[PDB]
Amino acid sequence: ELSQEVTQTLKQWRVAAVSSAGLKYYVGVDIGGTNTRLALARAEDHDTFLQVLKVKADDTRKLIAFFDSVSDSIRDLLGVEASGACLAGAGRISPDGEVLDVTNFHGDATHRRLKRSELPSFLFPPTKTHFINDLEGTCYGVSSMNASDALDQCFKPLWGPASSDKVTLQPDHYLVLAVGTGLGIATLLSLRGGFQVMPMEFGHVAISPVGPANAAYAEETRLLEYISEKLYNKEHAIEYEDIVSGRGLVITYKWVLDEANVQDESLRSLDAGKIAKNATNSEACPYAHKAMMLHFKFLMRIAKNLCIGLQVRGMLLAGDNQVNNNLFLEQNLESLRAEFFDHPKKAWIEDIDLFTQTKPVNLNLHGALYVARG
């Protein structure tokens, strides 16, 4: 079952199949840890696309059923096969490009892994289908929009030497981060004509502490030990993603509530989104604020250290979820900056630009559709 807008649109598209140019269109997929989205774009649609379906899926067998279903649906409306496909997924891709491993899907290896050869040929031509990482897809989307001087349509400066200027990327490196089901991290590279994308897995590196004289030192130690207990039985130091994610905000929230002996089962049951919204009212939901503060504090800490290690010129906070959290970010700007410049080498990152996405736009789908064209 497809929507009216999609149905009417595909009817307009298919008249071109009996034209000289034919109907050449491409498939793009954003496989997130919680939701998957699929979109189509014709050869001439250069900055736009048609989202045909989204689904809540946390294993690959359910994706296969979604792909089969939506493939048959588009086939009944277009007739003509897709000319190329790219799936940007929230995990790692095998050296041969054949297999995606979705890091935060649940179950055994079969339910976390997705092979190209399992995909329906209609939407996923066997020789013209590629896997990329989701943040790798974000970078191609960003690079594509930077090339057509359009990044200012969905990004805004939060600080840095370029913050009075319209958003545009210089030929240096830029770090891209996205907070969602997981912590996504990639880098736009300018080494040696264009931007090269490097996919990364830095959301899973062990966290760093604060200085022993920091006022948050005792309480951060308790939070890290609490999370390390619940996830790893204290055997490992937690990953940044164990805090900087949806479930991470939820578990930090439960820690804030345990230290305050707040037994209220209603405030106890909120999901990441309600905690995050509640946090924009500092005086009326102080516990949501405290958890969100620590959530974004650790996002600033991993971003700080990657800026130093990668020697980037700027960084971009991306994702549609980030749009809803920019208000919290501005309400707590000093607290975030205090964290970001808390480093012996703070002089090195004083001139780092920070951009944040301000309008909902699925940069992953744009990136996947850029790759799918070849």
List residues binding ligand BGC (CB under 6 A). 33, 90-91, 103-104, 133-135, 180, 182, 184, 201, 203, 241
Query: Looking only at Cα atoms, what is the longest distance across the chain?
Result: 73
Q: Which of 304, 282, 297, 318 shows the shortest CA–CA distance to 252?
A: 297
Rounded distance between C-alpha atoms, residue 295 and residue 290, angstroms: 9
Task: Find the shortest distance in angstroms from Cβ 312 to Ca ion.
Answer: 11
Task: Find the shortest distance in angstroms from Cβ 293 to its own copies.
Answer: 19
Rounded distance between C-alpha atoms, residue 297 and residue 317, angstroms: 14
Question: Dihedral of CA 207/169/171/93: which sign?
Answer: positive
Task: Find the shortest distance in angstroms from Cβ 348 to ligand BGC.
Answer: 9
Q: Which of 117, 116, 125, 184 shows the shortest CA–CA distance to 322?
A: 184
Q: Which of 192, 200, 182, 193 shows the shortest CA–CA distance to 315?
A: 200
Task: Find the shortest distance in angstroms from Cβ 202 to its own copies.
Answer: 4
Interaction of residue 94 with its own copies, rule CB under 8 A:
no
199, two tokens: 């996919």
Binding window for Ca ion (CB under 5 A); candidates: 3-11, 105-113, 187-195, 347-355: 187-195
Binding window for Ca ion (CB under 5 A); candidates: 7-15, 23-31, 182-190, 249-257: 182-190
The residue behind tokens 């390390």 is: 228
217 or 232: CB nearest ligand BGC: 232
141 or 184: CB nearest ligand BGC: 184
Could you give the residue ranges of the DSSP H alpha helices within 149-245? 217-232
Interaction of residue 172 with Ca ion, rule CB under 5 A:
yes
> Count of residues binding Ca ion (CB under 5 A)?
4
Query: Which of 336-341's residues contact partners 24+ apart within 8 Å by CB, and which partners?
Result: 336/296, 336/297, 336/300, 337/159, 339/297, 339/300, 339/301, 339/304, 340/300, 340/301, 340/303, 340/304, 341/304
Interaction of residue 233 with Ca ion, rule CB under 5 A:
yes
Binding residues among 187-226 for its own copies as defined by CB under 8 A: 189, 191-192, 196-202, 204-214, 224-225
70 or 243: CB nearest its own copies: 243
Binder of residue 182, out of its own copies, ligand BGC, Ca ion, none (CB less than 5 to 8 A by kind): ligand BGC
The residue behind tokens 């799918």 is: 372
Please report, as ranges, the residues that interact with Ca ion according to CB under 5 A: 171-172, 190, 233
Please report, as ranges, the residues that interact with its own copies according to CB under 8 A: 92, 95, 172, 185, 189, 191-192, 196-202, 204-214, 224-225, 228-229, 231-237, 239, 301, 305-306, 308-311, 342-345, 348
